[PDB]
Amino acid sequence: FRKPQPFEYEGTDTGVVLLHAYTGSPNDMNFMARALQRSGYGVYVPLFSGHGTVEPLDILTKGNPDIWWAESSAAVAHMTAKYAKVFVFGLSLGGIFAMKALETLPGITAGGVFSSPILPGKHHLVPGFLKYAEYMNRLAGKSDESTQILAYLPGQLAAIDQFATTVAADLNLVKQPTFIGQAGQDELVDGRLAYQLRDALINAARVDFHWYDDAKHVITVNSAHHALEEDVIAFMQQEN
């Protein structure tokens, strides 16, 4: 097994922070980070605490929304110290922190979300996590940990939602141009909520909204990724 590590690409004028998904890793952002690199952007992809190991309990017991927020904030600061302009985007979980960054952190030009409606709703993250864990056990040749997982999973998902509702209540604070990309066949989160995110951004300079018709949740990696990369780069170039 290869532990995915955080990674960084050097740029000149503009840098981008990319924040990964729950149960994800910097691997979530390989295609995106490279697309940005080809267009001359600096890129930074941190690893959230408890992620990127062969042991799914690490996510539940070594990470939490508060730690991941601190890590997101540090990542932004790392990039704003170096580049004239900084954009911040996040996939699903990462999107929550991306939006909080726009709301509360200084020195950010623009940013937004990939399949991250922010507003909590019906989701399939419980089956998602369990399927992920099962696959991780399969690679590790380790016995099933579902019972141990279920002691923590509902609590951690509640904690994520709790963090998210504060971000949602603060959406009025966003002044920056905001990008919203959403999977149209999203099996993990309620895509409909992305419209409510759009409508809540009442003070954003602009809202650039994209719907990826046939795409599953992970639009940074699946069939939608070329389109998403184009749309994100177009967004950034518009706000240069």
Of 186 and 208, which has the nearer Cβ to Cl ion? 186
Which of the ranges 29-37, 56-64, 86-94, 167-175 carries the binding residues for Cl ion, by CB under 5 A?
86-94
Ramachandran sector of residue 107 (left: φ over 0; alpha: ψ -120 to 50; beta: rest): left
Distance, in Å, from the CA atom of 123 to the CA atom of 117, rounded to the nearest integer, reads: 11
Residue whose entry in the numeric block shows the structure tokens 């966003």: 174
DSSP state letter for 177: -
CB of 93 to Cl ion, least distance (A): 4
223 is catalytic: no
Cβ neighbors of 59 (< 8 A, separation 6 or more) are 22, 23, 50, 51, 156
Q: Does 218 bind Cl ion (CB under 5 A)?
A: no
Q: Shortest CA distance to 44 belongs to which of 2, 69, 14?
A: 14
143 is catalytic: no
Out of 14, 72, 92, 176, which residue is the one contacting Cl ion (CB under 5 A)?
Answer: 92
39 is catalytic: no
Give residues 14-33 in contact with Cl ion (rule: CB under 5 A). 21-22
CB of 202 to Cl ion, least distance (A): 26
Catalytic center residues: 92, 186, 217
Binding site for Cl ion (CB under 5 A): 21-22, 92-93
